[PDB]
């Protein structure tokens, strides 16, 4: 009794795990997957299926396989809901046992099998029920998992658009301990099947406060494109008391490395929005830093994620699903690490509510009808 | 450093207090013994935990035939609840008010119970007509009528007593998962769906269906004392007994055992004999640690009394736990703080991609 807190809500700063998966070296200004810099993987054109194996296994040589033909069973109108409920439904039909009752090779195989199915579900969900499915023979001639995704969704995709997705998916594959990765590790720590953990991680990812979803910079980029001057549009947005999307406080020590590789991809692949995007980035950084010289302002990677995704004909409402597709690498790597660690994540809570009390001394007891 | 957040305090709740040292469980200060003794139905205990007071219990479920038929009752509700958001227009928690979130939690809760009853009834049987479900006066009787059509009134009191005892039990992994998702601002249907996922884990606690083979051995053997010896002699774990949770007896097992006797469960006497035989064995072979009966033992007897099969008991546990989940989700919204821990890198240092094992088997696009 008389339990009392002392200048203590949440787990901010509390270390819950140690990991060998990746290091978001924010003070050093670099992001590394198993010690491999994110800039060397994107610039040397390593496909997402191979980076998936690198994050999960710790080394190359066992990338993602082609997804088996499984037409999407859920058409809810929300791509997130379609993949969240769909992945949870894989366990009974595929005979997924709990994590406690399977070895590591089976869990790694079940994670790889579910990750490619999530990519297929997102491709089918975005194509919509108002379109006949892409034939399997056309999907089969694709050589990479990223090209398989674009073919299942678009049918005849531009190879430049496939190259753009590989740049984004790799750069968004894993970025430390967030709410969606924490949810995946907590569910997996109970010994549940890997399908339940990925399903719960998608639900946590849909939260607006999770962060990382591509920014709403397309309408602003539409104004500068036809108005001409980027400095006048950005200045007009701030002078009218509006918010600049895609720019704010710093995440890394300086420029975000994921933002540098996405901008480099937009230029290398010849994105029609690139020249306007650079002018908007230069004007936004200059105007925001000039107005508040004592505050750090950097370009969010969501700014260039929106440009790269829109270049690949990705609609704005589908961009959050594109983020979930890439994050399956980090979620799967963290689920396997939690399986080997083998300990339930269970925090505690201090009770500060009412003390012992009879039922009759509670508000609305007269409303209660006893059996 | 020790991983697992063991002992780390994450929140300060006013919902319920599992008094471990005192051996009591209270919902907003009200003992579960009084709620079960005075026959408070589950729909009212839901209101007590979520709102903090009686008055606005759970309403009858709207007609919504289950769209998911996966063969697992847990998967049917985990997927079913997540699909409620687009059809019902569930906005993110960040963009709705408190009274709307409370109604959204109450709406999805009675829908989760409706989904379990339909899933357990199975697709190979015609649905119970709505006019029969409309005859019930409590939510618990509504669940059994939609599931069994003509349920035994004693089985309704058994489920009603079990659901009250399992409604809330502090910061467990399933309740922690619901708060973590809700802290991101996601809709209440996604927080409940994720909580069911962490719920199906075997290392979460509450696996009552696993004790059934032991009770079946005693039925044909005749002497439970020698059967408990046989399980321990072969080296496998004894089901439903072991480590102490509260100071001594679990309050939920105390309530469930009393409910099994008063309602005249046919398998009560064998369960009491198995409980006596199992307690004396583990206390004799390991006399240096405190041994108590786990709640999953008497929870299985009570659930088996109400004709709940083995592959449905986990879904019955999520049904009652919706009260605790919704109460903590609503508390998490008012808190308005994103919960996330940190991790330390202990992996390899900066290296080139060509130095990684298997770079020869990678094709550059």
XYZ file of C-alpha atoms in Angstrom:
736
model
C 0.000 0.000 0.000
C 0.784 3.752 -0.050
C 2.696 3.135 -3.286
C 4.120 6.438 -4.506
C 5.838 7.401 -7.785
C 8.789 9.787 -7.946
C 9.311 12.055 -10.985
C 8.692 9.163 -13.369
C 4.859 7.573 -18.465
C 6.271 5.283 -21.142
C 9.661 3.707 -21.763
C 11.493 6.747 -23.143
C 15.223 6.155 -22.773
C 14.646 2.682 -21.299
C 16.834 0.106 -23.038
C 14.781 -3.004 -23.796
C 16.994 -4.940 -26.232
C 20.438 -5.274 -27.726
C 20.593 -5.916 -31.453
C 23.053 -6.881 -34.176
C 20.536 -6.157 -36.945
C 21.247 -2.525 -37.824
C 22.683 0.685 -36.383
C 21.011 4.042 -37.155
C 24.182 5.980 -36.304
C 22.405 9.321 -36.053
C 25.268 11.138 -34.315
C 27.701 9.902 -36.975
C 25.314 10.576 -39.846
C 25.189 7.049 -41.274
C 22.749 4.143 -41.450
C 24.166 0.617 -41.613
C 22.519 -2.784 -42.087
C 24.686 -5.373 -40.297
C 27.614 -2.982 -40.644
C 26.978 -2.333 -44.358
C 26.368 1.337 -45.134
C 22.981 2.120 -46.660
C 24.638 4.226 -49.372
C 26.776 1.388 -50.740
C 23.774 -0.949 -50.963
C 21.623 1.530 -52.897
C 24.412 2.886 -55.112
C 25.571 -0.632 -56.039
C 21.958 -1.621 -56.816
C 21.338 -4.413 -54.310
C 17.749 -5.597 -54.685
C 15.317 -5.607 -51.766
C 15.149 -9.406 -51.696
C 18.885 -9.596 -51.011
C 18.822 -6.861 -48.359
C 15.970 -8.781 -46.714
C 18.295 -11.769 -46.321
C 21.144 -9.546 -45.107
C 19.047 -8.071 -42.292
C 17.518 -11.395 -41.237
C 20.340 -13.892 -41.787
C 23.264 -11.500 -41.341
C 24.768 -12.357 -44.740
C 23.844 -12.625 -48.403
C 22.960 -15.712 -50.420
C 19.351 -16.579 -49.483
C 17.120 -13.818 -50.826
C 13.345 -13.755 -50.960
C 11.670 -16.302 -53.266
C 8.916 -15.594 -55.803
C 5.512 -15.368 -54.149
C 3.226 -18.353 -54.627
C -0.083 -17.738 -56.453
C -2.537 -16.658 -53.743
C -5.312 -14.281 -54.837
C -6.134 -11.712 -52.178
C -9.097 -12.824 -50.013
C -9.740 -9.486 -48.232
C -11.221 -6.460 -50.042
C -11.986 -3.960 -47.280
C -11.161 -0.717 -49.098
C -7.999 -0.166 -47.027
C -4.707 -1.627 -48.241
C -3.414 -1.690 -44.657
C -6.466 -3.613 -43.442
C -6.238 -5.957 -46.436
C -2.664 -6.959 -45.603
C -3.118 -6.900 -41.806
C -6.054 -9.322 -41.801
C -4.612 -11.279 -44.726
C -1.306 -12.100 -43.039
C -3.041 -13.189 -39.828
C -5.117 -15.611 -41.935
C -2.038 -17.391 -43.323
C -1.375 -19.388 -40.142
C -4.313 -21.865 -40.345
C -4.186 -22.525 -44.094
C -0.375 -22.832 -44.116
C -0.145 -24.659 -40.778
C 2.007 -22.097 -38.980
C 2.883 -23.402 -35.526
C 3.699 -21.104 -32.586
C 7.237 -19.770 -32.333
C 7.910 -21.922 -29.257
C 7.255 -25.176 -31.148
C 9.409 -24.572 -34.253
C 13.135 -24.374 -34.922
C 14.937 -21.347 -36.335
C 15.132 -22.589 -39.934
C 11.360 -23.094 -40.041
C 10.723 -19.654 -38.537
C 13.102 -18.057 -41.046
C 11.342 -19.907 -43.869
C 7.909 -18.902 -42.559
C 9.004 -15.259 -42.312
C 10.313 -15.226 -45.890
C 7.160 -16.975 -47.108
C 4.909 -14.423 -45.396
C 6.941 -11.373 -46.453
C 6.575 -12.042 -50.188
C 2.869 -12.757 -49.700
C 2.479 -9.353 -48.045
C 4.115 -7.764 -51.096
C 1.735 -9.687 -53.359
C -1.317 -8.683 -51.305
C -0.338 -5.006 -51.497
C 0.120 -5.291 -55.270
C -3.297 -6.936 -55.667
C -5.017 -4.567 -53.227
C -3.796 -1.470 -55.076
C -4.676 -2.870 -58.508
C -8.236 -3.178 -57.215
C -11.134 -5.556 -57.750
C -12.195 -3.522 -60.810
C -9.294 -4.917 -62.870
C -8.564 -8.482 -64.026
C -5.476 -9.893 -62.350
C -2.106 -9.911 -64.098
C -1.431 -13.378 -65.585
C 1.079 -15.522 -63.725
C 3.166 -16.211 -66.844
C 3.905 -12.479 -67.107
C 4.888 -12.289 -63.432
C 7.105 -15.360 -63.861
C 9.493 -13.742 -66.356
C 10.503 -11.217 -63.678
C 13.906 -11.870 -62.133
C 13.758 -9.755 -58.948
C 11.150 -9.586 -56.200
C 10.812 -5.839 -56.787
C 10.098 -6.387 -60.487
C 7.618 -9.120 -59.530
C 5.741 -6.630 -57.341
C 5.547 -3.944 -60.041
C 4.384 -6.484 -62.627
C 1.631 -7.898 -60.401
C 0.361 -4.340 -59.824
C 1.008 -2.371 -63.031
C 1.274 -5.167 -65.608
C 3.840 -3.499 -67.891
C 6.030 -1.352 -65.625
C 8.865 0.930 -66.634
C 12.233 -0.558 -65.574
C 13.145 2.902 -64.253
C 10.117 2.690 -61.955
C 11.278 -0.737 -60.756
C 14.738 0.695 -60.058
C 13.136 3.497 -58.030
C 11.228 1.076 -55.789
C 14.403 -0.891 -55.037
C 16.043 2.349 -53.886
C 13.142 3.222 -51.576
C 12.457 -0.264 -50.197
C 16.113 -0.749 -49.246
C 16.347 2.681 -47.600
C 13.190 1.991 -45.546
C 13.906 -1.653 -44.696
C 14.923 -1.106 -41.062
C 15.542 1.885 -38.796
C 15.884 0.767 -35.191
C 13.351 0.422 -32.390
C 10.040 2.038 -33.354
C 6.443 1.307 -32.373
C 5.798 -1.164 -35.205
C 9.061 -3.042 -34.629
C 8.446 -3.027 -30.869
C 4.961 -4.467 -31.416
C 6.422 -7.235 -33.589
C 8.965 -8.158 -30.909
C 6.401 -8.067 -28.087
C 3.940 -10.356 -29.888
C 6.753 -12.704 -30.926
C 8.050 -12.754 -27.335
C 4.822 -14.515 -26.304
C 5.701 -17.427 -28.597
C 2.898 -16.649 -31.059
C 3.219 -17.526 -34.736
C 5.121 -15.177 -37.036
C 1.912 -14.391 -38.939
C 0.339 -12.934 -35.795
C 3.410 -10.789 -35.110
C 3.529 -9.334 -38.627
C -0.225 -8.698 -38.467
C 0.057 -6.807 -35.186
C 3.041 -4.842 -36.481
C 0.975 -3.607 -39.433
C -1.721 -2.355 -37.063
C 0.847 -0.385 -35.071
C 2.363 0.930 -38.308
C -0.953 2.487 -39.377
C -0.808 4.958 -36.478
C -0.394 8.603 -37.473
C 2.101 9.198 -34.644
C 4.316 6.298 -35.767
C 6.221 8.496 -38.215
C 8.008 7.702 -41.466
C 5.051 7.699 -43.851
C 5.725 9.752 -47.015
C 4.908 13.433 -46.568
C 2.107 15.374 -48.267
C 4.360 17.415 -50.544
C 2.606 16.631 -53.841
C 0.098 19.551 -53.839
C 2.924 21.969 -53.022
C 5.043 20.442 -55.796
C 2.069 20.951 -58.126
C 2.046 24.697 -57.427
C 5.770 25.315 -57.976
C 5.635 23.245 -61.172
C 3.174 25.609 -62.873
C 3.962 28.869 -61.037
C 7.675 28.757 -61.863
C 9.402 30.379 -58.889
C 10.023 28.083 -55.924
C 11.300 30.837 -53.618
C 8.059 32.810 -53.948
C 5.793 29.812 -53.318
C 7.690 28.678 -50.213
C 7.832 32.253 -48.913
C 4.101 32.641 -49.526
C 3.324 29.446 -47.618
C 5.210 30.654 -44.541
C 3.944 34.240 -44.813
C 0.353 32.929 -44.728
C 0.963 30.910 -41.559
C 0.993 27.482 -43.222
C 3.251 24.478 -42.671
C 5.933 23.299 -45.083
C 5.596 19.548 -45.587
C 8.749 17.443 -45.638
C 10.941 19.862 -43.663
C 11.520 20.210 -39.937
C 13.825 19.414 -37.031
C 16.855 17.225 -37.651
C 16.696 13.439 -37.373
C 20.364 12.642 -37.983
C 23.302 14.880 -37.076
C 23.052 16.511 -40.511
C 21.440 15.384 -43.760
C 19.559 12.100 -43.467
C 21.464 9.401 -45.408
C 18.198 7.856 -46.599
C 17.212 11.279 -47.948
C 20.512 11.578 -49.828
C 20.180 8.245 -51.641
C 16.539 8.884 -52.573
C 17.425 12.290 -54.023
C 20.326 10.682 -55.895
C 17.924 8.111 -57.352
C 15.449 10.762 -58.522
C 18.228 12.495 -60.471
C 19.809 9.298 -61.814
C 16.510 7.892 -63.135
C 15.340 11.218 -64.587
C 12.274 11.938 -62.480
C 10.162 14.681 -64.120
C 9.553 16.227 -60.675
C 13.253 16.278 -59.744
C 14.196 19.779 -60.916
C 11.239 21.318 -59.080
C 11.959 19.192 -55.999
C 15.533 20.500 -55.739
C 14.357 24.104 -56.105
C 11.726 23.525 -53.414
C 14.276 21.881 -51.108
C 16.767 24.723 -51.574
C 14.096 27.379 -51.009
C 12.534 25.626 -48.008
C 15.852 25.046 -46.233
C 17.019 28.607 -46.911
C 13.728 30.228 -45.873
C 13.185 28.107 -42.750
C 16.765 28.572 -41.530
C 16.717 32.324 -42.204
C 13.512 32.914 -40.226
C 14.655 30.871 -37.191
C 18.477 30.910 -37.191
C 18.753 29.161 -33.802
C 16.685 26.109 -34.811
C 18.033 23.171 -36.802
C 16.148 22.517 -40.049
C 16.781 19.505 -42.291
C 14.959 17.803 -45.150
C 12.836 14.857 -44.032
C 13.367 11.660 -45.993
C 9.579 11.616 -46.464
C 10.061 14.518 -48.894
C 12.207 12.507 -51.308
C 10.251 9.331 -50.549
C 7.142 11.073 -51.884
C 9.006 12.214 -55.008
C 10.491 8.772 -55.704
C 7.205 6.946 -55.086
C 5.161 9.390 -57.182
C 7.736 8.959 -59.959
C 6.919 5.227 -59.931
C 3.186 5.971 -60.439
C 2.404 5.212 -56.777
C -0.796 7.026 -55.698
C -0.712 9.053 -52.496
C -3.121 6.723 -50.681
C -0.885 3.760 -51.595
C 2.352 5.319 -50.293
C 1.876 4.148 -46.656
C 1.510 0.594 -47.988
C 4.786 0.979 -49.898
C 6.478 1.830 -46.591
C 4.990 -1.266 -44.933
C 6.302 -3.422 -47.794
C 9.906 -2.359 -47.237
C 9.701 -2.527 -43.438
C 8.945 -6.272 -43.620
C 12.721 -6.799 -43.718
C 13.233 -5.091 -40.365
C 10.173 -6.706 -38.792
C 11.253 -10.202 -39.854
C 14.837 -9.693 -38.675
C 13.614 -8.488 -35.275
C 11.141 -11.363 -34.921
C 13.871 -13.950 -35.523
C 16.183 -12.203 -33.051
C 13.385 -12.200 -30.468
C 12.868 -15.930 -31.069
C 16.521 -16.718 -30.317
C 16.567 -14.329 -27.345
C 13.592 -16.188 -25.878
C 12.088 -13.988 -23.177
C 8.632 -12.504 -22.739
C 8.448 -8.704 -22.780
C 6.201 -7.817 -19.827
C 6.491 -4.429 -18.086
C 4.798 -3.414 -14.839
C 2.359 -0.702 -13.791
C 1.680 1.039 -10.477
C -1.954 1.231 -9.367
C -3.069 4.715 -8.296
C -6.827 4.179 -8.555
C -9.474 3.818 -5.857
C -8.933 1.584 -2.859
C -11.040 -1.361 -1.699
C -14.721 -0.585 -2.112
C -18.014 -2.468 -2.097
C -20.045 -2.730 -5.324
C -23.015 -0.902 -3.778
C -20.927 2.246 -3.133
C -20.186 2.805 -6.843
C -21.884 5.243 -9.203
C -24.830 3.706 -11.013
C -25.237 0.578 -8.888
C -28.996 1.173 -9.097
C -28.654 0.796 -12.876
C -27.187 -2.685 -12.341
C -29.631 -5.597 -12.528
C -28.487 -8.682 -10.618
C -29.087 -12.156 -12.057
C 21.714 -5.084 -17.872
C 18.873 -7.609 -18.190
C 16.510 -7.585 -21.205
C 12.754 -8.052 -21.113
C 11.665 -4.877 -19.258
C 11.153 -7.031 -16.160
C 10.143 -4.846 -13.228
C 10.344 -1.697 -15.367
C 7.367 0.549 -14.631
C 5.656 1.760 -17.810
C 2.326 3.295 -16.737
C 0.231 4.322 -13.732
C -3.256 2.872 -14.133
C -6.502 3.435 -12.242
C -8.327 0.535 -13.913
C -7.628 -2.457 -11.670
C -5.194 -3.733 -9.047
C -3.887 -7.320 -8.998
C -2.856 -7.314 -5.329
C -0.193 -10.033 -5.424
C 0.915 -9.764 -1.789
C -2.678 -9.362 -0.591
C -4.043 -12.258 -2.632
C -6.944 -10.240 -4.053
C -8.007 -8.893 -7.449
C -10.025 -5.672 -7.598
C -11.695 -3.899 -10.526
C -11.719 -0.169 -9.702
C -11.463 -1.183 -6.048
C -14.306 -3.726 -6.286
C -13.298 -7.293 -5.450
C -14.048 -9.892 -8.110
C -15.456 -12.093 -5.332
C -18.243 -9.579 -4.668
C -18.968 -9.136 -8.382
C -19.281 -12.899 -8.893
C -21.155 -13.512 -5.630
C -23.737 -10.791 -6.327
C -24.118 -12.044 -9.933
C -22.907 -8.987 -11.850
C -23.049 -9.833 -15.550
C -20.047 -9.339 -17.822
C -21.653 -6.441 -19.692
C -21.696 -4.384 -16.495
C -18.155 -5.347 -15.467
C -17.059 -4.078 -18.888
C -18.565 -0.684 -18.037
C -16.999 -0.692 -14.563
C -13.473 -1.270 -15.880
C -13.682 1.083 -18.871
C -15.746 3.957 -17.455
C -14.859 3.537 -13.781
C -18.513 3.193 -12.736
C -21.708 1.324 -13.538
C -24.500 2.669 -15.711
C -23.561 2.171 -19.376
C -23.103 -1.559 -19.891
C -22.463 -3.409 -23.131
C -25.248 -3.227 -25.741
C -26.584 -6.091 -27.870
C -24.491 -6.836 -30.940
C -25.712 -5.714 -34.345
C -26.369 -8.378 -37.007
C -23.038 -8.868 -38.793
C -22.385 -12.353 -40.202
C -18.742 -13.333 -39.773
C -16.798 -12.658 -43.012
C -13.678 -14.650 -42.013
C -13.654 -18.473 -41.946
C -10.045 -19.540 -41.368
C -10.653 -22.583 -39.152
C -9.139 -20.885 -36.083
C -11.472 -18.862 -33.864
C -8.612 -16.585 -32.782
C -7.771 -15.743 -36.396
C -11.442 -15.082 -37.178
C -11.665 -12.283 -34.595
C -8.127 -10.965 -35.106
C -8.876 -10.473 -38.805
C -12.546 -9.644 -38.255
C -11.949 -6.747 -35.869
C -9.269 -5.246 -38.124
C -11.765 -5.177 -41.015
C -14.315 -3.246 -38.931
C -12.403 0.023 -39.377
C -13.136 0.715 -43.090
C -16.752 -0.490 -43.025
C -17.665 1.327 -39.791
C -15.575 4.425 -40.528
C -13.224 4.064 -37.550
C -10.949 7.102 -37.632
C -7.520 7.030 -35.954
C -7.503 7.489 -32.187
C -5.638 10.788 -32.612
C -8.548 12.340 -34.554
C -11.521 11.290 -32.387
C -12.834 12.345 -28.990
C -13.115 10.284 -25.806
C -16.856 9.565 -25.930
C -16.493 8.408 -29.542
C -13.557 6.127 -28.714
C -15.484 4.629 -25.792
C -18.473 3.873 -28.025
C -16.171 2.469 -30.712
C -14.574 0.179 -28.124
C -17.963 -0.977 -26.832
C -19.219 -1.570 -30.380
C -16.196 -3.644 -31.411
C -16.262 -5.589 -28.124
C -19.762 -7.026 -28.540
C -18.850 -7.675 -32.178
C -15.789 -9.662 -31.095
C -18.040 -11.798 -28.888
C -20.493 -12.243 -31.766
C -17.638 -13.319 -34.049
C -16.395 -15.952 -31.589
C -19.877 -17.456 -31.224
C -20.388 -17.637 -34.998
C -16.893 -19.030 -35.611
C -17.359 -21.687 -32.923
C -20.790 -22.622 -34.279
C -19.103 -23.196 -37.638
C -20.094 -22.670 -41.259
C -21.516 -26.216 -41.512
C -24.597 -25.212 -39.493
C -27.388 -22.687 -40.139
C -27.181 -19.507 -38.096
C -29.405 -18.989 -35.062
C -32.384 -16.765 -35.996
C -32.090 -13.204 -34.728
C -35.455 -13.377 -32.948
C -34.004 -16.057 -30.656
C -30.950 -13.923 -29.862
C -33.326 -11.021 -29.147
C -34.890 -13.005 -26.277
C -31.782 -12.772 -24.082
C -31.497 -10.111 -21.380
C -27.702 -10.063 -20.895
C -24.713 -10.030 -23.226
C -23.444 -13.375 -21.909
C -26.753 -15.132 -22.605
C -26.682 -13.526 -26.061
C -23.298 -15.150 -26.723
C -24.436 -18.655 -25.764
C -27.704 -18.406 -27.714
C -25.994 -17.291 -30.927
C -23.527 -20.171 -30.463
C -25.643 -23.066 -29.145
C -29.202 -21.963 -29.955
C -30.743 -23.467 -26.800
C -28.067 -23.015 -24.118
C -28.296 -24.337 -20.584
C -28.873 -21.479 -18.095
C -26.268 -22.931 -15.722
C -23.648 -22.777 -18.485
C -24.403 -19.066 -18.908
C -23.614 -18.441 -15.234
C -20.379 -20.405 -15.679
C -19.209 -18.294 -18.625
C -20.425 -15.112 -16.927
C -18.387 -16.007 -13.838
C -15.342 -16.922 -15.935
C -15.461 -13.770 -18.072
C -15.552 -11.560 -14.969
C -12.506 -13.298 -13.476
C -10.503 -12.945 -16.720
C -11.564 -9.407 -17.667
C -8.350 -7.660 -16.571
C -5.027 -8.595 -14.975
C -2.571 -5.715 -15.228
C 0.226 -5.072 -17.706
C 0.510 -8.373 -19.537
C 1.874 -8.738 -23.066
C -1.578 -8.650 -24.682
C -2.616 -5.573 -22.683
C 0.802 -4.011 -23.289
C 0.399 -4.619 -27.032
C -2.992 -2.883 -27.077
C -1.531 0.188 -25.366
C 1.522 0.328 -27.646
C -0.622 0.331 -30.790
C -3.076 2.819 -29.272
C -0.167 5.110 -28.373
C 0.610 5.479 -32.095
C -2.874 6.917 -32.652
C -4.145 3.944 -34.662
C -7.853 3.166 -34.631
C -9.267 1.101 -31.778
C -9.974 -1.815 -34.132
C -6.267 -2.146 -34.963
C -5.254 -2.000 -31.289
C -7.689 -4.794 -30.423
C -6.604 -6.848 -33.444
C -2.964 -6.623 -32.381
C -3.855 -7.516 -28.796
C -5.466 -10.754 -29.994
C -2.253 -11.585 -31.856
C -0.081 -11.313 -28.751
C -2.861 -13.167 -26.913
C -2.568 -16.436 -28.858
C 1.034 -16.859 -27.697
C 1.552 -19.952 -25.548
C 4.095 -18.155 -23.323
C 1.469 -15.507 -22.461
C -0.405 -17.508 -19.832
C -3.928 -18.845 -19.864
C -3.687 -22.117 -21.790
C -6.550 -24.052 -20.168
C -7.207 -26.560 -22.969
C -3.856 -28.259 -22.311
C -4.998 -29.790 -18.993
C -7.766 -31.813 -20.664
C -5.638 -34.926 -21.463
C -4.651 -35.204 -17.791
C -8.251 -35.236 -16.553
C -9.104 -37.803 -19.237
C -6.373 -40.126 -17.940
C -7.877 -40.046 -14.438
C -11.364 -40.954 -15.691
C -10.315 -44.434 -16.850
C -7.466 -44.934 -14.359
C -9.427 -44.541 -11.104
C -6.779 -43.117 -8.748
C -5.536 -39.614 -9.559
C -2.595 -39.948 -7.153
C -0.818 -42.573 -9.271
C -1.611 -40.782 -12.546
C 0.105 -37.575 -11.415
C 3.112 -39.719 -10.500
C 3.100 -41.221 -13.993
C 3.271 -37.842 -15.730
C 6.150 -36.666 -13.531
C 8.047 -39.969 -13.754
C 8.232 -39.735 -17.555
C 9.726 -36.237 -17.286
C 7.099 -34.023 -18.929
C 5.597 -30.956 -17.285
C 2.518 -31.195 -15.082
C -0.289 -29.092 -16.538
C -2.127 -26.487 -14.481
C 0.184 -26.529 -11.445
C 3.545 -25.115 -10.467
C 4.996 -21.672 -9.855
C 3.292 -19.358 -7.381
C 1.774 -16.153 -8.791
C 0.077 -14.334 -5.904
C 1.320 -14.659 -2.319
C -0.506 -17.995 -2.149
C -3.791 -18.924 -3.828
C -4.763 -17.178 -7.048
C -8.004 -15.222 -6.463
C -9.341 -16.142 -9.909
C -8.797 -19.855 -9.266
C -10.554 -19.394 -5.914
C -13.596 -17.910 -7.668
C -13.595 -20.389 -10.559
C -13.369 -23.420 -8.260
C -16.283 -22.138 -6.169
C -18.290 -21.562 -9.357
C -17.560 -25.106 -10.548
C -18.987 -26.532 -7.312
C -22.044 -24.302 -6.865
C -23.178 -24.794 -10.472
C -22.665 -28.557 -10.090
C -20.088 -29.208 -12.789
C -20.112 -32.974 -13.499
C -16.296 -33.173 -13.561
C -15.806 -31.273 -10.288
C -14.952 -34.198 -8.001
C -12.239 -35.585 -10.285
C -10.764 -32.089 -10.633
C -10.626 -31.651 -6.849
C -8.956 -35.058 -6.553
C -6.453 -34.167 -9.282
C -5.796 -30.812 -7.600
C -5.140 -32.487 -4.243
C -2.926 -35.162 -5.809
C -0.936 -32.721 -7.951
C -0.375 -30.252 -5.105
C 0.888 -32.945 -2.726
C 3.263 -34.347 -5.360
C 5.015 -31.128 -6.400
C 5.173 -29.966 -2.773
C 6.829 -33.271 -1.818
C 9.277 -33.571 -4.723
C 10.177 -29.849 -4.565
C 9.552 -28.768 -0.958
C 11.705 -25.617 -1.150
C 9.433 -23.590 -3.458
C 5.796 -22.572 -3.109
C 3.438 -24.543 -5.363
C -0.064 -23.332 -6.222
C -2.805 -24.293 -8.654
C -2.712 -22.171 -11.795
C -5.903 -20.405 -12.841
C -5.798 -22.211 -16.204
C -6.670 -25.446 -14.371
C -10.058 -24.382 -12.994
C -10.648 -22.140 -16.016
C -10.551 -25.269 -18.181
C -12.959 -27.109 -15.870
C -15.378 -24.168 -15.942
C -15.079 -23.704 -19.711
C -15.361 -27.450 -20.363
C -18.493 -27.408 -18.192
C -20.087 -24.963 -20.663
C -19.303 -27.263 -23.642
C -16.349 -25.119 -24.788
C -14.042 -27.358 -26.875
C -10.273 -27.297 -26.555
C -9.695 -25.301 -29.761
C -12.116 -22.587 -28.573
C -10.913 -21.905 -25.004
C -8.233 -19.396 -26.157
C -10.950 -17.386 -27.924
C -13.099 -17.378 -24.775
C -10.136 -15.868 -22.919
C -9.879 -12.997 -25.411
C -13.642 -12.444 -25.108
C -13.542 -11.538 -21.421
C -10.214 -9.721 -21.751
C -11.848 -7.170 -24.082
C -12.906 -5.319 -20.922
C -9.303 -4.912 -19.797
C -8.043 -4.132 -23.300
C -10.640 -1.436 -23.994
C -10.147 0.095 -20.540
C -6.384 0.371 -21.086
C -6.783 1.640 -24.657
C -9.081 4.425 -23.442
C -6.614 5.252 -20.664
C -3.764 5.251 -23.194
C -5.587 7.790 -25.374
C -6.042 10.266 -22.518
C -2.359 9.798 -21.670
C -1.382 10.812 -25.211
C 2.209 9.558 -25.073
C 3.866 7.362 -27.694
C 5.563 4.457 -25.918
C 8.784 3.163 -27.437
C 11.977 1.861 -25.804
C 15.528 1.987 -27.163
C 18.124 -0.582 -28.195
C 21.924 -0.665 -28.151
C 23.881 -1.832 -31.180
C 26.186 -4.761 -30.394
C 26.660 -5.949 -33.964
C 29.622 -5.741 -36.329
C 31.292 -2.468 -37.195
C 31.382 -0.729 -40.574
C 32.311 -3.134 -43.363
C 32.068 -3.201 -47.141
C 29.367 -5.210 -48.936
C 32.057 -7.244 -50.726
C 33.315 -8.481 -47.332
C 29.954 -10.049 -46.413
C 29.479 -13.804 -46.702
C 27.701 -14.547 -49.967
C 28.522 -11.445 -52.017
C 29.463 -13.774 -54.890
C 25.843 -15.017 -55.054
C 24.345 -11.511 -55.413
C 23.447 -10.086 -58.826
C 23.643 -6.321 -59.304
C 20.649 -4.905 -61.183
